Amino acid sequence: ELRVGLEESELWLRFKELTNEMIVTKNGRRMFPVLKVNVSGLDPNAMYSFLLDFVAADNHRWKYVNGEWVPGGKPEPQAPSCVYIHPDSPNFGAHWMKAPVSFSKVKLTNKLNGGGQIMLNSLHKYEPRIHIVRVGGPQRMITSHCFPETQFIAVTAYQNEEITALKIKYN
Numbered sequence: 001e002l003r004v005g006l007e008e009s010e011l012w013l014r015f016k017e018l019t020n021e022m023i024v025t026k027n028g029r030r031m032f033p034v035l036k037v038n039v040s041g042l043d044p045n046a047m048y049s050f051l052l053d054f055v056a057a058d059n060h061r062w063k064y065v066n067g068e069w070v071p072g073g074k075p076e077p078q079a080p081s082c083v084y085i086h087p088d089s090p091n092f093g094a095h096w097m098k099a100p101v102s103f104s105k106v107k108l109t110n111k112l113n114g115g116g117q118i119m120l121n122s123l124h125k126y127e128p129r130i131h132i133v134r135v136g137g138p139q140r141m142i143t144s145h146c147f148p149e150t151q152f153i154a155v156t157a158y159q160n161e162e163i164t165a166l167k168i169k170y171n
């Protein structure tokens with residue numbers, strides 16, 4: 001049985017309980033905290049690519065009002081984000097299970113751009129999600145995992161200074 005777990009969930013829970021924010025920029029900004037995933041139950045000798053994308057958690061625009069995040073009134077459908085391929089992809093089951101899979105080089109942008117960067121809509125709430133794709137074999141297979149604990153609102157600057165403080169404290 002293939003098992004996927006969140007490394008440093010205790011740190012992510014500190015951010016989640018304040019409402020987490022991630023900066024997005026024209027050229028794209030790396031995430032803190034970084035999504036790190038513990039994986040076991042892979043075939044050490046099978047071939048896999050690790051994919052990261054971001055699900056719009058709701059169809060609303062959010063706004064920071066008298067120090068609290070509140071959803072707009074007017075839902076729009078949120079098309080799914082583009083996928084980021086972990087740069088170690090493709091790789092042997094063994095490679096992925098020997099240390100936490102770390103998405104330290106994904107960059108979050110608010111502008112359609114060349115390559116690498118994932119465009120998110122500013123002031124939308126997002127849930128990180130991975131896909132483990134078994135490649136090369138005859139039977140292709142995908143297993144998907146969500147990380148509720150890692151939810152955030154995409155922002156051009158931090159609104160909650162409690163978030164600013166946590167980011168600096170643990171970076």
Ligand SMILES: Cn1cc(Cl)c(C(=O)NC2CCCC2)n1
Pocket residue numbers: 049051085089090133135
């Ligand atoms: C051009 N390129 C470089 C890498 Cl790496 C990949 C890749 O892993 N593609 C697919 C494997 C199944 C999911 C995405 N494609």
